[PDB]
């Protein structure tokens, strides 16, 4: 599923990560536009072998598992594939876990190139939130 930028506003805001570990939704929204353009279908292969999955391009080297990353580690209990669907939870409760693990949101490079220090409300300006 392609989001709009409102409608994946509104359900990041349903699911719980407007101001989570102190982040504001614009923030959630921003990264999900630079990590996937809104994609929930969303995957890129890293040059180590590791795949980012889904709205926000979680790594399979520590966060699930996609039995193609030797060595790798599945922090959030989950099948890469979970990441990949058009209901955004498995990626919000995956996303929570990362940005407590003490780099913030950090953790998202297109974040912290993109979005980070920006104004971040931008992005959920004329939004029914
Ligand atoms: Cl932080
Ligand atoms: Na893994």
Redesign the pocket.
């Known amino acids: 599923k392609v989001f709009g930028r409102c409608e994946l506003a509104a359900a990041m805001k349903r699911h719980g990560l407007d101001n989570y570990?102190?982040?504001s939704l614009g923030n959630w929204v921003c990264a999900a536009k630079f990590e996937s353009n809104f994609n929930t279908q969303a995957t890129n292969r890293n040059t180590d072998g590791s795949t980012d999955y889904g709205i926000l391009q979680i790594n399979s080297r520590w966060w699930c598992n996609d039995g193609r990353t030797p060595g790798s580690r599945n922090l959030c209990n989950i099948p890469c594939s979970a990441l990949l669907s058009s209901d955004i939870t498995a990626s919000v409760n995956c996303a929570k876990k990362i940005?407590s693990d003490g780099?913030?949101?950090?953790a998202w490079v297109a974040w912290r190139n993109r979005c980070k220090g920006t104004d971040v409300q931008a992005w959920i300006r004329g939004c029914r939130l």
């Open positions: 570990r102190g982040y940005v780099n913030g949101m950090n």
